[PDB]
């Protein structure tokens, strides 16, 4: 009986890992497509399956990080959203922390997304008239030329500036979508999605 | 592009159906074993996957009903839990409504579980000192000999009675667990669980 219970728990862990990969692929697709409601529902499903997983492989941690990163980016303009125990950390700052934690290549695209998130983390505060919060976000992020221009913009208390239109929220989203395309290609061959696709194709 | 999006949505529906069956099996096992925390976490996962399903087969509706029924039975003593739009309906009354809706055989076990839920729906109100609510539950349920004894017990305002010790909450749970064993046997051959079990066995 105890041996059977042990084998059953192991089988549940295997199935949960397959569900995590499928839900990550679905979340990536909803993010890339801009399907907001599908993204919300898939986020709910991914969070629940994650709470049922105990021990994680390095790949499973990476998959969870990718899900957490996309969730924070989708909430980047929601300054009332608290993703960290420290209530001062804004959603884009939380996304930056995960982006720097993922075991992935630090290629040119990685650094471009990183710098666009840093700029937008300040921009979103400015756009809401939260000037003191923009200065606090600036101090945490940098804790020279790029930094100096940002501080000057914050000091000018301009709710809008040409610099943010050049390094825009849309530009950040498009660069992140380029990265999401690579994750989609890499996880499209995962077990559950492959099996489901074969069934759908078999009925054509 | 639209054809690809259509095939992807169909594949997601196939995968969601497989996840629903696996989560139902896991919920049944947690209920049978009395693993309260695993039941809560699996309930959360099942609810999320269900919200991602649109069109349902008759079997998928039955599976959802089985999940909903077990959730109400697990919450049978939680009189603050509201499962229906009508806030007056108690959890055991909600379980009775689903039990009468499931497309299943009405064998002797079916009627025994039905009658034990009717008795306990009144008993749980009595045990909390909710005498007027017990009389209201009685009126909704019956809306002769068994009914007459129950009304007399409610009128005597006895928070405890030998009848409820004979037709007890534990007896209701044990009869329901006998039914859950049949559901477990029937759904153990579902795709995700079979594939996960084969992997675990392959590594032995
Ligand atoms: Ca805030
Ligand atoms: Ca109540």
XYZ file of C-alpha atoms and ligand atoms in Angstrom:
410
model
C 0.000 0.000 0.000
C 2.815 2.448 0.904
C 4.793 1.402 -2.222
C 1.671 2.040 -4.374
C 1.157 5.469 -2.718
C 4.819 6.283 -3.457
C 4.516 5.282 -7.130
C 1.291 7.327 -7.413
C 2.996 10.446 -5.941
C 5.887 9.989 -8.392
C 3.408 9.689 -11.307
C 1.615 12.871 -10.124
C 5.005 14.718 -10.093
C 5.731 13.535 -13.692
C 2.255 14.688 -14.845
C 2.625 18.046 -13.055
C 5.927 18.640 -14.890
C 4.216 17.935 -18.225
C 1.345 20.302 -17.288
C 3.831 23.061 -16.293
C 5.554 22.932 -19.739
C 2.223 22.941 -21.614
C 0.916 25.891 -19.525
C 4.184 27.819 -20.093
C 3.801 27.320 -23.884
C 0.151 28.478 -23.694
C 1.084 31.535 -21.572
C 3.903 32.443 -24.057
C 1.487 32.179 -27.008
C -1.187 34.306 -25.260
C 1.473 36.941 -24.450
C 2.830 36.967 -28.045
C -0.730 37.194 -29.507
C -1.922 39.835 -27.034
C -4.796 37.537 -25.927
C -5.298 39.231 -22.530
C -8.115 37.036 -21.157
C -6.440 33.771 -22.240
C -3.243 35.052 -20.573
C -5.139 35.724 -17.269
C -6.821 32.271 -17.261
C -3.575 30.465 -18.211
C -1.723 32.410 -15.455
C -4.297 31.106 -12.916
C -3.781 27.519 -14.136
C 0.049 27.800 -14.113
C 0.100 29.212 -10.543
C -2.089 26.321 -9.260
C 0.022 23.537 -10.905
C 3.229 25.183 -9.556
C 1.841 25.015 -5.961
C 1.417 21.235 -6.498
C 5.111 20.791 -7.457
C 7.719 20.212 -4.692
C 11.247 19.399 -6.005
C 12.149 21.244 -9.225
C 14.715 20.532 -11.970
C 16.884 23.458 -13.195
C 14.762 23.467 -16.397
C 11.492 23.567 -14.367
C 12.832 26.566 -12.355
C 13.698 28.295 -15.684
C 10.153 27.569 -16.996
C 8.592 29.038 -13.796
C 10.879 32.105 -14.083
C 9.766 32.617 -17.708
C 6.081 32.465 -16.544
C 6.768 34.846 -13.636
C 8.705 37.262 -15.893
C 5.873 37.461 -18.481
C 3.290 37.990 -15.714
C 5.236 40.964 -14.308
C 5.753 42.455 -17.803
C 1.989 42.100 -18.517
C 1.382 43.933 -15.169
C 4.139 46.549 -15.841
C 1.703 49.499 -15.911
C -0.293 48.195 -12.862
C 1.588 50.148 -10.119
C -0.904 48.843 -7.486
C 0.300 45.201 -8.138
C 2.658 43.885 -5.417
C 4.787 40.941 -6.623
C 7.409 40.958 -3.838
C 7.315 40.771 -0.008
C 8.828 44.287 -0.078
C 5.755 46.341 -1.104
C 7.971 49.098 -2.610
C 9.155 46.947 -5.561
C 7.216 47.786 -8.752
C 6.213 45.109 -11.317
C 8.910 46.070 -13.890
C 11.570 45.997 -11.076
C 10.339 42.479 -10.161
C 10.626 41.497 -13.917
C 14.212 42.879 -13.969
C 15.144 40.757 -10.909
C 13.868 37.569 -12.612
C 15.495 38.495 -15.960
C 18.861 38.668 -14.147
C 18.225 35.275 -12.384
C 17.239 33.125 -15.393
C 19.984 30.683 -16.485
C 20.148 31.892 -20.078
C 22.598 33.412 -22.557
C 23.420 37.110 -22.053
C 23.388 37.894 -25.733
C 22.703 41.365 -27.273
C 18.899 40.778 -27.091
C 19.199 39.964 -23.359
C 20.916 43.290 -22.600
C 18.555 45.287 -24.866
C 15.480 43.888 -23.044
C 17.215 44.524 -19.700
C 17.884 48.212 -20.534
C 14.394 48.742 -21.989
C 12.848 47.370 -18.737
C 15.081 49.760 -16.664
C 13.947 52.769 -18.745
C 10.265 51.768 -18.667
C 10.393 51.065 -14.887
C 11.050 54.812 -14.470
C 8.742 55.883 -17.381
C 5.645 54.158 -15.941
C 6.085 56.069 -12.636
C 6.538 59.400 -14.482
C 3.432 58.816 -16.642
C 1.297 58.362 -13.487
C 2.686 61.587 -11.915
C 4.634 59.515 -9.340
C 7.865 61.636 -9.450
C 9.220 60.703 -6.006
C 8.525 56.987 -6.746
C 10.384 57.352 -10.111
C 13.459 58.686 -8.204
C 13.217 55.762 -5.722
C 12.970 53.208 -8.580
C 16.004 54.916 -10.195
C 18.042 54.530 -6.964
C 17.154 50.841 -6.572
C 17.902 50.006 -10.214
C 21.284 51.693 -10.323
C 22.090 50.229 -6.850
C 26.672 56.920 -16.565
C 25.363 58.713 -19.742
C 22.097 56.662 -19.837
C 21.720 57.021 -16.028
C 22.387 60.817 -16.175
C 19.695 61.491 -18.856
C 17.133 59.480 -16.820
C 17.882 61.430 -13.602
C 17.528 64.743 -15.505
C 14.128 63.619 -16.923
C 12.930 62.686 -13.389
C 14.180 66.077 -12.038
C 12.277 67.921 -14.828
C 9.113 66.142 -13.533
C 7.949 65.695 -17.165
C 5.035 63.165 -17.318
C 6.089 62.688 -20.993
C 9.508 62.956 -22.731
C 10.829 62.178 -26.258
C 13.370 59.702 -24.753
C 10.539 57.431 -23.515
C 8.884 57.644 -26.993
C 12.187 56.430 -28.542
C 12.770 53.689 -25.889
C 9.042 53.024 -25.569
C 6.839 50.506 -23.723
C 5.813 49.135 -27.175
C 9.497 48.727 -28.164
C 10.137 46.819 -24.892
C 7.102 44.553 -25.567
C 8.261 43.858 -29.172
C 11.798 42.913 -28.063
C 10.343 40.637 -25.351
C 8.006 39.060 -27.977
C 11.153 38.253 -30.115
C 12.500 36.324 -27.066
C 9.093 34.642 -26.458
C 9.186 33.335 -30.066
C 12.430 31.438 -29.214
C 10.849 29.987 -26.015
C 7.771 28.931 -28.076
C 9.970 27.173 -30.636
C 11.995 25.454 -27.895
C 8.962 24.186 -25.871
C 6.643 23.318 -28.827
C 8.228 19.804 -28.765
C 7.223 19.180 -25.126
C 5.249 15.923 -24.448
C 1.665 17.165 -23.830
C 1.649 19.667 -26.749
C 3.207 17.095 -29.166
C 0.641 14.414 -28.167
C -2.309 16.874 -28.430
C -1.086 18.159 -31.832
C -0.744 14.570 -33.168
C -4.379 13.821 -32.091
C -5.694 17.023 -33.770
C -3.701 16.208 -36.968
C -4.933 12.552 -36.892
C -8.564 13.820 -37.089
C -7.834 15.969 -40.191
C -1.705 31.879 -39.730
C -5.432 31.603 -38.853
C -5.393 27.846 -39.668
C -2.354 27.406 -37.352
C -4.112 29.388 -34.569
C -7.170 27.135 -35.010
C -5.103 23.933 -34.786
C -3.316 25.313 -31.693
C -6.660 26.098 -29.962
C -7.879 22.574 -30.777
C -4.650 21.089 -29.327
C -5.085 23.212 -26.158
C -8.679 21.850 -25.790
C -7.388 18.232 -26.130
C -4.669 18.880 -23.499
C -7.160 20.574 -21.145
C -9.419 17.495 -21.348
C -6.472 15.256 -20.429
C -5.571 17.583 -17.514
C -9.207 17.562 -16.264
C -9.260 13.712 -16.082
C -5.869 13.562 -14.323
C -6.930 16.248 -11.788
C -10.238 14.418 -11.139
C -8.289 11.187 -10.408
C -5.932 13.107 -8.073
C -8.866 14.816 -6.285
C -10.633 11.404 -5.854
C -7.458 9.862 -4.385
C -6.912 12.800 -1.977
C -10.562 12.526 -0.851
C -10.334 8.722 -0.355
C -7.011 9.060 1.571
C -8.167 12.010 3.685
C -5.209 14.111 2.415
C -6.839 17.490 3.181
C -4.074 19.809 1.910
C -3.543 17.822 -1.316
C -7.333 17.953 -1.825
C -7.334 21.800 -1.422
C -4.408 22.291 -3.860
C -5.862 19.826 -6.414
C -9.270 21.589 -6.127
C -7.541 24.904 -7.016
C -5.874 23.295 -10.059
C -9.111 21.600 -11.243
C -11.123 24.859 -10.981
C -8.517 26.756 -13.079
C -8.348 24.110 -15.888
C -12.193 23.985 -15.990
C -12.333 27.792 -16.600
C -10.074 27.200 -19.650
C -12.505 24.635 -21.159
C -15.382 25.857 -23.397
C -17.379 23.024 -25.075
C -17.747 19.908 -22.898
C -18.478 16.249 -23.739
C -21.106 14.416 -21.618
C -18.199 12.539 -19.948
C -16.355 15.833 -19.193
C -19.551 17.254 -17.579
C -19.797 14.048 -15.461
C -16.109 14.434 -14.428
C -16.705 18.102 -13.414
C -19.842 17.058 -11.466
C -17.822 14.389 -9.611
C -15.205 17.084 -8.690
C -17.926 19.545 -7.625
C -19.749 16.860 -5.588
C -16.584 15.865 -3.653
C -15.764 19.537 -2.975
C -19.213 20.142 -1.443
C -19.007 16.928 0.638
C -15.533 17.976 1.920
C -17.122 21.370 2.861
C -20.291 19.736 4.338
C -19.633 21.020 7.881
C -18.561 24.525 6.639
C -21.993 26.263 6.924
C -20.364 29.625 5.979
C -19.442 28.203 2.476
C -21.766 29.439 -0.311
C -21.703 27.163 -3.387
C -24.870 28.445 -5.107
C -26.136 31.870 -6.280
C -28.931 31.407 -3.705
C -26.995 32.060 -0.459
C -29.480 29.942 1.572
C -28.361 26.610 0.025
C -25.984 24.729 2.359
C -23.001 22.690 1.056
C -24.662 19.261 1.604
C -27.830 20.544 -0.217
C -25.577 21.628 -3.128
C -23.964 18.086 -3.085
C -27.474 16.524 -3.180
C -28.405 18.642 -6.243
C -25.290 17.452 -8.133
C -25.780 13.817 -7.006
C -29.258 13.912 -8.600
C -27.859 15.488 -11.853
C -24.964 13.092 -12.575
C -25.670 10.677 -15.467
C -25.013 7.513 -13.477
C -26.763 4.325 -12.367
C -29.294 4.700 -9.530
C -28.254 1.513 -7.820
C -28.702 0.741 -4.067
C -25.425 2.582 -3.220
C -26.688 5.690 -5.069
C -29.871 5.855 -2.965
C -28.022 5.079 0.303
C -25.578 7.978 -0.288
C -28.517 10.209 -1.280
C -30.422 9.466 1.970
C -27.296 9.803 4.136
C -26.633 13.279 2.610
C -30.298 14.298 3.334
C -29.971 13.211 6.993
C -26.566 14.872 7.455
C -27.758 18.110 5.755
C -30.147 18.487 8.722
C -27.681 17.039 11.323
C -24.928 19.583 10.555
C -27.383 22.471 11.187
C -28.574 20.899 14.476
C -24.991 20.345 15.703
C -24.232 24.076 15.236
C -27.406 25.103 17.153
C -29.002 26.335 13.888
C -32.538 24.942 14.596
C -34.494 27.306 12.326
C -31.969 26.662 9.490
C -32.386 22.863 10.037
C -36.190 23.267 9.556
C -35.592 25.341 6.376
C -33.167 22.709 4.981
C -35.796 20.038 5.804
C -38.474 21.948 3.823
C -36.226 22.398 0.775
C -35.096 18.760 0.747
C -38.559 17.264 1.013
C -39.839 19.861 -1.531
C -42.967 9.706 5.342
C -41.539 7.627 8.284
C -37.928 8.859 7.707
C -39.206 12.439 7.130
C -41.414 12.314 10.289
C -38.543 11.213 12.620
C -36.315 14.019 11.236
C -39.005 16.693 11.811
C -39.514 15.435 15.401
C -35.723 15.629 16.056
C -35.647 19.233 14.713
C -38.702 20.140 16.888
C -36.959 18.679 19.992
C -34.073 21.120 19.240
C -31.576 18.390 20.265
C -28.011 19.371 19.148
C -27.278 15.593 19.332
C -29.520 12.521 18.769
C -28.922 8.728 18.546
C -30.414 8.708 14.994
C -27.553 10.907 13.696
C -25.015 8.590 15.448
C -26.560 5.617 13.562
C -26.775 7.483 10.191
C -23.575 9.405 10.903
C -21.337 11.838 8.988
C -18.598 9.130 9.093
C -21.026 6.546 7.627
C -21.896 9.003 4.806
C -18.159 9.599 4.109
C -17.439 5.817 4.042
C -20.286 5.118 1.584
C -19.084 8.000 -0.631
C -15.498 6.602 -0.445
C -16.882 3.211 -1.752
C -18.232 5.147 -4.795
C -14.938 7.097 -5.183
C -13.075 3.747 -5.395
C -15.157 2.875 -8.519
C -14.410 6.313 -10.088
C -10.672 5.796 -9.318
C -10.699 2.384 -10.999
C -12.578 3.756 -14.025
C -10.302 6.826 -14.571
C -6.931 5.185 -13.673
C -6.641 4.234 -17.398
C -6.900 7.869 -18.567
C -4.076 9.101 -20.906
C -1.969 11.379 -18.637
C -2.005 8.999 -15.617
C -1.197 5.938 -17.822
C 1.724 7.772 -19.516
C 3.093 9.078 -16.163
C 2.787 5.609 -14.553
C 4.638 3.976 -17.501
C 7.519 6.521 -17.104
C 7.754 5.890 -13.316
C 7.702 2.081 -13.912
C 10.332 2.410 -16.718
C 12.769 3.987 -14.186
C 12.357 1.078 -11.707
Ca 2.320 51.000 -5.818
Ca -24.574 29.817 6.237
